[PDB]
Specification:
Keywords: mammalian reovirus, cryo-em, RNA dependent RNA polymerase, transcription, viral protein
Distance between the termini of chain A: 62 Å
Subcellular location (chain E): Virion
Oligomer: part of a larger assembly
Strand content of chain A: under 5%
Entry title: In situ structure of polymerase complex of mammalian reovirus in the pre-elongation state
Bound molecules: zinc ion
Number of strands of chain A: 0
Largest interface: C-F, 46 and 30 residues
Protein name (chain E): Lambda-1 protein
PDB class: viral protein
């Protein structure tokens, strides 16, 4: 089992350790602005793909 | 006896007695003594498609594998005009509903 | 990486402290004392090939034939008393006192070898059966145990001759002598051989000492011999009270295997060396850092077989590259071995603290989000270990010919960078430092197009298509066809529109590091194994000027600091312009081009190390490697002269024969790319220091000493010998049965054999491989790189193709071969003496002979033998049919000429006709051979035989043997041919009718030795005395010793030399200090 | 080469000589027997295949390809390599060459 | 794959192998009944028309 | 008297080079391997390959070109005489179109 260096979270597999460190540059206000921007445009219906037919039976 | 057959005489005769079999008799679409055709009452194109699928299944069953390499159906070529002999038609040209 | 986890363990044995995990426990304990598969088999074969067994000795006598009795002579009889015979006195006679004596071939039957080689040919006497020796090889279809394929005799015989030679490879050992006290000789020294039994040997070895009491044939012969040639007649003693070096003795020995061991000894004497040149070779491979000492005194003739030739070195190198083509899993641990072997030696120690302690000097204003110094630190990450990446990058320079170390994808700016960014600039800095240390021929254009990717929209250059544009990733430019024309012809980069891509292209064409060289090793003791370069030369992509002083310290006059200075000043020029990045504050621009200036002016010793010390280290490592360096020439920035491939051949193409003509189209391209992190190479170039007060000659004189105390390198040369000897004897033995390209003689055409296909040749080559691996004590792969193709037409060559199409090839001339010399010698002497290995020549004649004469069927009278050009003989063949008789008329058979003939007269069959109609001919013919007048001469070339004896005093019929033979003849096999030959008598006997059927054609009775062997004469039988033509050295006083009549007789008794050398290890003779 | 012996007799009768006209007309009838029915053509073709398999000297194993391609176990360590790609594409562990 | 791989047996003789392979397949010949069948087929076609 | 074959036949010969470019199928395999070598060589048609795979590609194409396959030799010599032996014993004698 391996552990991270920021926040000291201990995990088991090394690929999971890499995933945790990758889940962890610029100033703190700028990271807050970037994360707010991405969370705003996260689940907007401009990014999403591969939807379904509706079984319309209207709009003739 | 001292000589052992190198291709194997039993194996070669076992193969050639299976190659010896005559041709299957396709009487379908031909009249009988009474005057009626001897088919299955389905049209000619669907009979040909069903028949090629049946022969593909027979080729799959003949070797011990489950899925056949060599196939007769869905061969990647269009053959929508092929129609093989069935008993929907008669010798006159009409239908054989009754 | 972090390693510790939640463990199950406690209780340090001191300090009584129990704690979390065993991985913390053992570090806690240590502080108390501190502070107070085909791929894996190919890999293992390259890392340590199996050393062979050359020196094998033979105490005891050196023969390969024996004289076996068959039927005992009558010692009690009523015509001559028992007091005549020397059997009545138990006198140990040198020859078997019997009635019929024959000589058969047991491989040496007498040796006292220390290392047995599991390879032998044991033959029963011809009264027993000898058919398994001739059905051993490739009769996987023969039903009967007694049968063997007649169409496959020659492959059996060739494997038996190779088997016989591969046994008879020993060195005759000098044992010890004793001066005679008995008056039989005139005081001659005898030879004492070890063993529990020695009573028979002093009569077997020396036939010319015995009493001569009577007029027996043995006594006639021995008293006809000449007396003074007994035992030792010459010795060469070089010391007082030590063993004599070599002697010459008269004893029983056949000239065949005496000459085989003589040729083998001449081979090892060509191999021989001496410790003075061992000292010289190790000194000039050390380049003065390691000194060894050899003695200066009269020696005792040590034998060290180590010196081999340049041709054998090059052939083994070609076979090894052919082995390791296109895998890289056989390649990685070799470079790991070179990296750790370099870590044991190298004086510098990469400390990451230098770059951090010099980047903590920067002066920034902290009212700023953008941190260039922290971008440097978080980008480089100096704080990691493991710069074995840098050591493997240093090790690939040796092995560029199969390894192209390229920079990894992951150190590139992620699909184009921008010059307005910062981390892309530091990407470009990392790449511009790391790319000169790789062996990729596309490294300059990859650096240039990294810059051309980093500026897009700012400057434009004309590319040559719309597939590889300016926005195309720089990693995809790994082929010299993909180089831009605007890179070479620089004026297409206009200096007004694009002035920075203008001048960075000027940096590449001028100040990129020039290739240079250094010399290593010696070709004197061990030959040079490189082949596209001249001998003893090593090629380096950077310049090497040797250091003057031995206490090294800083100066800045080397090419890597020049290169880093040019990169830093052009990055200063790039951060200079306000056009390319207008959003920067004028304070920050000047302040943090000051950072680029300080990073240009950093102090580090890795560039001076790469200039001055690491080439000396590669020069002293490179002779001590299992894989010698394999190099294509380094070219700096030349589209004409880059290598595009390298390829080996293993078979010819067509009817064409010459390898320079068949080579350009029949090859296998070898080589593989490798990935390296540019970040580790860049930080190892930016940081490196020496121990604080070091002296280099002391450092290297300590470091290089154990790897020259090692002596593994000498053992690989014997493996190279046997690899070259094996491939040569493979093509020589395949040339006998298949029509190949090399000029060989062949003596075995008269033995019938198969029309051989490629599968037959591949199988026969596999058996030859297995025989040579069973001999010499090998277990890893041999000839398996060459059994993947056709073994019929084989060749060994290599070439690399330059980009313009000019190819440079190497065809090594194949050296001589003692093994194939001995095999061809054994084949020629078998051609003249075929009877001893069981073969008879000619053919046989089936026909009734009912008489009372005592002529031997292996030597028939010529009135009974007919041939093709004999009147009244029908010759059968292709058209053969049989018509039945009707109403009393005789049935008939179709002639080859279209004629009909009854079942009477003299016929000629090929054997194949009888085999193809083996049962139908029996019912038609066997009633007429027995009682009629029909006679068949079945022509078959060669056949094994058995011998059945009979009393000439009684009746004897042969139909129960010949009918069994004719019935057992099969389309795929025949049994041995049984002959019925009488027993020689001493006195007068009566005469009884004997009925013989199978007779030979020509003389096949060469294997007979003597008849009645104790009697004063031979009456009424086959007669033969002791063969005087064999024992030439005894019976001819005019013939001097060392006079062999080898290609027609073997002589069974001659002079043989005997050696008492010693083979000590190299460390036991020459040693360091 | 065969042979066939016999005694001289006149009254022996073995009726076995046809002409090419009959031999061709019966061939035309046998071709009209098929009529795009795939079971008419299947066992003839497959049994001739098995008979060629039992007579034929050529045995086939893909271990020649497997021994020439030295690269084994690469598909999960690195994403792509051509020797492993063509080995996994040819699939030498199948032995149905119908 | 059947084109890229395939070998002969390592002791092949064409005369032996082909005589042994051609003998039992000609022993189970039936072509003479086919000739008689073709006779009756052509006679029946002509009497049909 | 003739049987139309889609390839060339030669007289039967046990000993002949297994690498022989007089043979039609061997020549065909050789030229297809050479054209795919010329296709891979310059890396003009394959952007996006971040590694220089051209050495390994030409090596494995050379390995496939230089192989000990006896199938083209077999189809050149022994398969046509095998078809000529098997052909007039068939129950459905052959029906060829040029
Ligand atoms: Zn963390
Ligand atoms: Zn403790």
């Amino acid at each position: 089992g391996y552990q991270c260096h920021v926040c000291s979270a201990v995990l088991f597999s090394p690929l999971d350790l890499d995933a945790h460190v990758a889940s962890h540059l610029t100033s703190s206000e700028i990271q807050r602005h970037i994360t707010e921007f991405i969370s705003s445009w996260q689940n907007h219906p401009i990014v999403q793909v591969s939807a379904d037919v509706e079984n319309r039976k209207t709009a003739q | 006896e001292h000589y052992k057959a190198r291709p194997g005489i039993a194996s070669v005769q076992k193969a050639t007695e299976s190659a010896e079999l005559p041709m299957k008799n396709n009487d379908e679409g031909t009249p009988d003594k009474r005057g009626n055709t001897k088919g299955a009452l389905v049209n000619e194109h669907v009979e040909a498609r069903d028949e090629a699928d049946d022969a593909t299944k027979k080729q799959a069953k003949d070797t011990e594998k489950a899925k056949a390499q060599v196939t007769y159906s869905d061969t990647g070529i269009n053959n929508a005009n092929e129609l093989s002999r069935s008993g929907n038609v008669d010798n006159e040209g009409g239908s054989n509903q009754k | 990486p972090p390693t510790a986890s939640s463990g199950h363990g406690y209780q340090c044995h001191v300090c009584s402290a129990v704690l979390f995990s065993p991985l913390d426990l053992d570090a806690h304990v240590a502080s108390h004392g501190l502070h107070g598969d085909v791929e894996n088999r190919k890999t293992a074969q390259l890392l340590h090939a199996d050393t062979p067994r050359l020196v094998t000795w033979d105490a005891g006598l050196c023969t390969s034939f024996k004289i076996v009795p068959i039927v005992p002579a009558q010692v009690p009889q009523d015509v001559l008393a028992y007091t005549f015979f020397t059997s009545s006195y138990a006198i140990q006679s040198p020859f078997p006192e019997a009635a019929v004596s024959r000589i058969v071939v047991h491989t040496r039957w007498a040796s006292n070898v220390d290392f047995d080689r599991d390879s032998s040919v044991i033959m029963a006497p011809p009264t027993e059966n000898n058919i398994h020796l001739f059905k051993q090889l490739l009769n996987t279809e023969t039903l009967s145990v007694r049968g063997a394929n007649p169409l496959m005799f020659r492959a059996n015989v060739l494997h038996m001759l190779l088997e016989f030679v591969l046994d008879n490879l020993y060195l005759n050992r000098h044992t010890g002598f004793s001066q005679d006290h008995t008056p039989f000789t005139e005081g001659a020294n005898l030879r004492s051989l070890p063993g529990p039994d020695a009573e028979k040997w002093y009569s077997i070895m020396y036939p010319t000492r015995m009493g001569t009491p009577n007029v027996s044939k043995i006594c006639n012969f021995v008293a006809s011999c000449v007396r003074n040639r007994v035992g030792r007649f010459d010795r060469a003693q070089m010391m007082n009270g030590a063993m004599s070096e070599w002697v010459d003795v008269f004893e029983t020995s056949d000239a065949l295997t005496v000459s085989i061991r003589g040729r083998w000894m001449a081979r090892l004497a060509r191999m021989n060396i001496n410790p003075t040149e061992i000292e010289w070779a190790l000194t000039e491979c050390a380049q003065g850092y390691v000194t060894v000492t050899s003695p200066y005194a009269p020696s005792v003739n040590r034998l060290m077989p180590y010196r081999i030739s340049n041709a054998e070195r090059q052939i083994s190198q070609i076979i090894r590259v052919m082995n390791i083509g296109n895998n890289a899993t056989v390649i990685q641990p070799v470079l790991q071995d070179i990296s750790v072997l370099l870590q044991r030696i190298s004086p510098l120690q990469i400390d990451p603290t230098i770059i951090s302690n010099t980047m903590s000097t920067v002066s920034e204003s902290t009212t700023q989000t953008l941190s260039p110094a922290s971008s440097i630190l978080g980008k480089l990450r100096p704080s990691n270990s493991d710069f074995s990446s840098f050591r493997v990058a240093l090790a690939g320079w040796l092995y560029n010919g199969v390894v192209t170390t390229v920079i990894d994808d992951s150190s590139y700016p992620k699909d184009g960078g921008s010059v307005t960014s910062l981390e892309n600039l530091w990407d470009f800095f990392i790449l511009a430092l790391a790319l000169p240390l790789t062996t990729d021929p596309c490294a300059p254009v990859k650096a240039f197009m990294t810059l051309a990717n980093m500026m897009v929209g700012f400057e434009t250059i004309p590319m040559d298509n719309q597939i590889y544009t300016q926005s195309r990733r720089a990693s995809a430019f790994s082929t010299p066809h993909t180089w831009p024309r605007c890179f070479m012809n620089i004026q297409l980069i206009s200096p007004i529109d694009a002035p920075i891509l203008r001048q960075w292209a000027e940096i590449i064409h001028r100040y990129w590091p020039n290739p240079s060289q250094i010399r290593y090793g010696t070709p004197n003791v061990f030959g040079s194994a490189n082949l596209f370069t001249p001998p003893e030369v090593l090629l380096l992509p950077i310049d090497h000027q040797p250091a003057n002083v031995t206490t090294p310290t800083l100066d800045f006059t080397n090419e890597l600091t020049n290169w880093r200075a040019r990169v830093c000043e052009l990055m200063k020029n790039l951060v200079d312009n306000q056009r390319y990045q207008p959003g920067w504050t004028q304070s920050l621009v000047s302040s943090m081009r000051g950072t680029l200036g300080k990073l240009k002016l950093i102090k580090s010793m890795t560039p001076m190390y790469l200039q001055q010390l690491a080439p000396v280290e590669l020069a002293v490592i490179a002779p001590m490697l299992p894989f010698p360096p394999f190099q294509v020439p380094y070219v700096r920035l030349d589209r004409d002269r880059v290598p595009t491939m390298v390829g080996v051949t293993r078979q010819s193409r067509d009817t064409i024969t010459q390898p320079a003509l068949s080579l350009s189209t029949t090859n296998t391209t070898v080589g593989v790319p490798l990935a390296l992190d540019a970040r580790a190479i860049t930080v190892a170039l930016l940081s490196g220091k020496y121990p604080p007060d070091l002296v280099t000659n002391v450092w290297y004189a300590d470091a290089i000493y154990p790897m020259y105390a090692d002596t593994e390198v000498f053992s690989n040369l014997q493996r190279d010998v046997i690899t070259c000897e094996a491939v040569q004897t493979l093509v020589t033995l395949v040339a006998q049965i298949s029509e190949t390209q090399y000029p060989v003689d062949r003596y075995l055409d008269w033995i019938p054999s198969l029309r051989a296909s490629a599968a037959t040749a591949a199988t026969f080559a596999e058996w030859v491989n297995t025989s040579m691996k069973t001999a010499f004590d090998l277990s890893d792969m041999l000839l398996e790189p060459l059994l993947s193709g056709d073994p019929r037409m084989t060749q060994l060559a290599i070439q690399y193709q330059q980009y313009n199409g000019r190819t440079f090839n190497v065809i090594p001339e194949m050296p001589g071969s003692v093994i194939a010399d001995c095999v061809q010698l054994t084949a020629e002497v078998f051609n003249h003496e075929y009877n001893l290995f069981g073969i008879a020549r000619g053919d046989i004649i089936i026909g009734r002979v009912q008489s009372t004469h005592l002529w031997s069927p292996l030597a028939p009278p010529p009135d009974l033998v007919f041939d093709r050009d004999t009147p009244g003989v029908h010759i059968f063949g292709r058209d053969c049919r049989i018509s039945f008789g009707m109403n009393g008329a005789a049935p008939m058979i179709r002639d080859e000429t279209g004629m009909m003939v009854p079942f009477e007269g003299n016929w000629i069959f090929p054997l194949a006709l009888w085999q193809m109609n083996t049962r139908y001919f029996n019912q038609q013919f066997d009633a007429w051979i027995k009682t009629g007048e029909l006679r068949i001469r079945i022509e078959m070339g060669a056949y094994p035989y058995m011998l059945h004896y009979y009393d000439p005093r009684q009746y004897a019929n042969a139909w129960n043997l010949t009918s069994a033979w004719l019935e057992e003849i099969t389309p795929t096999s025949i049994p041995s041919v049984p002959f019925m030959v009488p027993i020689s008598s001493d006195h007068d006997i009566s005469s009884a009718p004997a009925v013989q059927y199978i007779i030979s054609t020509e003389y096949n009775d060469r294997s007979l030795f003597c008849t009645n062997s104790s009697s004063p004469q031979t009456i009424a039988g086959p007669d033969k005395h002791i063969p005087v033509e064999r024992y030439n050295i005894l019976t001819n006083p005019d013939a001097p010793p060392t006079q062999i009549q080898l290609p027609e007789v073997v002589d069974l008794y001659n002079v043989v030399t005997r050696y008492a050398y010693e083979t000590p290890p190299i460390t036991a003779v020459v040693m360091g200090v």
